[PDB]
């Protein structure tokens, strides 16, 4: 796994180079914006159970075929697996936010996931919907202006959305 700092190091090591002033400046800037990133992770994590439950409930309201007898999330074992997978994907998205790099999400979660769902007969497009609904809820919570020192977390929200989209694209 890499974090944002490790990734810049790795790139410099393969060139045999010390960091440039621009590179140093870019890492410094990440550090200076780090309280925003810690708030986003704390807020999402703190609301994880409702983000998952609410998105699940909505999915199944929109896609009743998934819970009808014979559907992929019918039976309590299948439902529990489906709920697990939502919490897993959200867990690895939040690791990516803390690290500022998608490598942990790509390597430990998304790699081979498409093929796993194909072999099972799980509908990846429906997984993607679930993801998208968690993304929307997560960003809303992360970027709530109440109860926090005011400031602009827009770049960070774009970065968070990109991780969720990356996940949704990898399963559909």
């Amino acid at each position: 796994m890499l974090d944002a700092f490790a990734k810049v190091v790795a790139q410099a090591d393969a060139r045999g180079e010390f960091l440039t002033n621009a590179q140093f400046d870019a890492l410094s800037n990440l550090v200076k914006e780090g309280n925003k990133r810690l708030d986003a992770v704390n807020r999402i994590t703190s609301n994880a159970s409702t983000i998952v439950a609410n998105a699940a409930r909505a999915l199944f309201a929109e896609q009743p075929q998934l819970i009808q007898p014979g559907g992929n999330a019918y039976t309590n074992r299948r439902m529990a697996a489906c709920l697990r997978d939502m919490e897993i994907i959200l867990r690895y998205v939040t690791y990516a936010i803390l690290a500022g790099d998608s490598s942990v999400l790509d390597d430990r979660c998304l790699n081979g996931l498409r093929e796993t769902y194909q072999a099972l007969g799980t509908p990846g497009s429906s997984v993607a919907v679930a993801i998208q609904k968690m993304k929307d809820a997560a960003i809303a919570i992360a970027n709530d202006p109440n109860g926090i020192t005011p400031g602009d977390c827009s770049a960070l929200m774009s970065e968070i959305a990109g991780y969720f989209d990356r996940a949704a694209a990898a399963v559909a």
Partner: protein
């Protein structure tokens, strides 16, 4: 690669757990220490050539035989001198990468793993490298917490060679 952030993640992941406040405190500690670490990194980088060139001379002064003895593992030809200066520059570059990452991961991965095997196989003495590192430590020009950061990674390398 071992950094305070990838350690925090790996810990939560091994237990199948979301990040908790224990882990986010560790990252905050890393973000606040980065001020000193980045001072040290930039200084070492800016003064790299002079540190490297000085350190190689310190080696040769401590161990004069390395400038005279016949054999490709010594610095008695132009090619050997260049290999030695190259190596010392690797060690300093790895110190700068540790300070940038906030941990030992870059030095562990790119230099320490295999180090004993390399030195034995090519007949490179660990003490040559320790001498170069001691020179860098004495002459980097840092003070305060920037000096504590640089010295922690220099001394890590020394311990790895001992």
């Amino acid at each position: 690669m071992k950094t305070p952030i990838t350690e925090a993640i790996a810990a939560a992941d091994t237990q199948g757990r979301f990040l908790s406040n224990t882990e986010l405190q560790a990252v905050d500690g890393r973000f606040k220490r980065a001020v000193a670490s980045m001072e040290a990194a930039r200084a070492l980088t800016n003064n790299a050539q002079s540190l490297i060139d000085g350190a190689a001379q310190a080696v040769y002064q401590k161990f004069p035989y390395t400038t005279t003895m016949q054999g490709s593992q010594y610095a008695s030809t132009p090619e050997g001198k260049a290999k030695c200066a190259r190596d010392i520059g690797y060690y300093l570059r790895m110190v700068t990468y540790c300070l940038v990452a906030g941990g030992t991961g870059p030095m562990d991965e790119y230099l320490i793993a295999g180090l004993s095997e390399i030195n034995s196989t090519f007949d490179l003495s660990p003490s040559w490298y320790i001498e170069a590192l001691k020179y860098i430590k004495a002459n980097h020009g840092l003070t305060g917490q920037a000096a504590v950061e640089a010295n922690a990674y220099i001394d890590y390398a020394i311990n790895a060679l001992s």
